Structure 1
């Protein structure tokens, strides 16, 4: 009925036990096989390797496990750069977020989940950002 996607935020709050409630929210956000962008996985790898200083082997195992069993990777779209440039004239986000939104839109995603992206907002009358932790 609606192609729902996610961002690195859901995975990051899922990973941590410091906030139990947000971790939970995040994990029941993952049970429904939410779609995911390859850039989301790349940023997830970056934050695991940089902030958490985790070993390469175990983060790679976790990435492979999640992609096989948990989240559905979305093929990177070839028009992502031009479309992100198009969204750039009307919107003012961090360009990484704009690429995330562009690739989510180009893959026919209806609902996006995140925190730092002004929830409830409509992006080119195609996809809306929702904060699920509230």
Structure 2
């Protein structure tokens, strides 16, 4: 009834256990097989290897695990850059966030889950950001 996507922060909060409630919430999202964008996967890999210094082998294995059983990667859309330029005029965010939103919308995603994106804001009348942890 509504295609749902996620950002890196959701999977990070899942991976982090300092915050039991937020980790629980993020894992609760993942029980719904939410969609996701490949750029989210790449950014997750980078953050894993930089902040947490985890091994390349372990990070790759977990990426494969999650992409195989829990979540669903979204095929990169060739119209991502043109649309992102279209979104930039009306929207002033980080180009990375703009790219994520561009790909999510181009895949008909109806809800995007993230914190640092001015929650509740509607992007081009096609996708409303939802902040779940509140």
Query: What TM-score comes out, normalization by structure 2 length?
Result: 0.99
Deviation at 1:67, TM superposition (A): 0.2
Q: How does 1:1-134 map to 2 (within 5 A)?
A: 1-134=1-134
Deviation at 1:105, TM superposition (A): 0.1
Deviation at 1:55, TM superposition (A): 0.4
Measure the CA separation in 2 of the matches of 1:24 and 1:97.
24
Deviation at 1:83, TM superposition (A): 0.3
Deviation at 1:77, TM superposition (A): 0.1
Measure the CA separation in 2 of the matches of 1:58 and 1:5.
24
Deviation at 1:125, TM superposition (A): 0.1
Deviation at 1:119, TM superposition (A): 0.6
Measure the CA separation in 1 of the matches of 2:35 and 2:101.
13
Query: Deviating runs (4+, > 2 A) in structure 1?
Result: none
| 1:57-78 Cα deviation digits (max 9, x unpaired) | 0000000000000100000000
| 1:5-28 Cα deviation digits (max 9, x unpaired) | 000010000000000000000000
Query: What TM-score comes out, normalization by structure 1 length?
Result: 0.99
Unaligned runs of 5+ in 2: none
Q: Tell me, what secondary structure is at the counterpart of 1:83?
A: helix
Backbone CA RMSD of aligned residues: 0.3
